Amino acid sequence: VPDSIDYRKKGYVTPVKNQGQCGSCWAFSSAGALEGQLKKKTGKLLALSPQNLVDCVTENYGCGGGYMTTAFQYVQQNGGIDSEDAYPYVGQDESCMYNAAAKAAKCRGYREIPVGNEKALKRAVARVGPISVSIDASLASFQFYSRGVYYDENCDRDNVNHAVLVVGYGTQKGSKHWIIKNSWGESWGNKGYALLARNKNNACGITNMASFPKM
């Protein structure tokens, strides 16, 4: 297991999108995780449809939030998720419009990551690929992040409100970190990305709802 990995550099990571006024972080986080897997198993990186997730994952709340496992199980039970070309993102709730011919990826379940265990998370990133996780993004220091390894002690390591995607890890000026991909546009963070404190005691509660799909 390497000291550093960065699935952007391995073609596993699609461009950064903007969710907008819609609370669909969980959808982008699922679609990105499925994208990382679809690339691992077929070798081809195709943009998947988070709008498919927000319309049709009826155990979730659309632009009111949801769970990523809830979406993985959905694409398992439904037999596929569409590509973002077939099913573009519009940022607003609507009725399900899943065309099965437009099916671009399948799923065979999901695995969750032991709560608290950052060592387990690192391993999972190293040997599976991008992982779907959820953090406390409520703080102003996060909404106006730009660079460096983010750490704010007021970060609730217990209650978690925003879904991002882990697309690798590493160290920088001595601080071990996680590389996460957000859905707030390229104007947020470091062109849509952020580094998060790693091995600093589960900062922002990143291993609370970590998961990835099976392919």
Tell me how crowded residue 84 is: count the other CB atoms within 10 A of its CB: 20
Q: State the resolution, in angstroms.
A: 2.9
Phi-psi region of 207 (alpha: psi -120 to 50; beta: other; left: phi over 0): alpha
Active site residue 159: no
Residue 182 is among the residues annotated as catalytic for this protein: yes
- Select which of 25, 56, 63, 155 is catalytic: 25
What span, in angstroms and rounded, lies between the C-alpha atoms of 173 and 152?
17
> Whose CA is closest to 150, among 136, 161, 129?
136
CATH of span 1-215: 3.90.70.10
Spell out the residues 6+ positions from residue 126 whose beta carbon is closer than 8 angstroms to its own. Answer: 1, 2, 5
Which tokens hold the place of 175? 């601080």
Measured CA distances, 101 to 77, 80, 194 (Å): 16, 10, 36
Catalytic residue among 107, 162, 177, 202: 162
**Three-state SS letters, 18-52:** ECCCCCCHHHHHHHHHHHHHHHHHHCCCCCECHHH
Q: Is 200 exposed, middle or buried (0-12, 13-18, 19+ CB in 10 A)?
A: middle
CA 19/CA 207 separation, integer angstroms: 23
How far apart (Å, rounded) are the C-alpha atoms in residues 39 and 49?
A: 15
List the catalytic residue out of 60, 182, 202, 208.
182
Number of H helices and E strands in the chain, helices first, is: 5, 10
Q: How many CA atoms lie within 13 A of 187 on its CB side?
A: 3
B/e letters for 164-182, b = 16+ CB within 10 Å, e = fewer, are bbbbbbbeeeebbbbbbbb
Q: Is 162 a catalytic residue?
A: yes
Of the candidates 111, 24, 126, the one whose C-alpha atom is nearest the C-alpha of residue 76 is: 111
The DSSP H or E segment spanning 104 is strand 103-105
Task: Give the closest residue to 47 by CA, choosing from 2, 71, 15.
Answer: 15
Strand partners, 150: 196
Rounded Cα distance, 26 and 55, in Å: 13
Query: What is the distance between the alpha carbons of residues 66 and 58, in angstroms, rounded to a whole number?
Result: 10
Q: What angle do CA 114, 117, 121 make, to 5 degrees?
A: 85
Query: CB–CB of 81/103 below 8 Å?
Result: yes
CB-CB contact of 169 with 176 (8 Å): yes
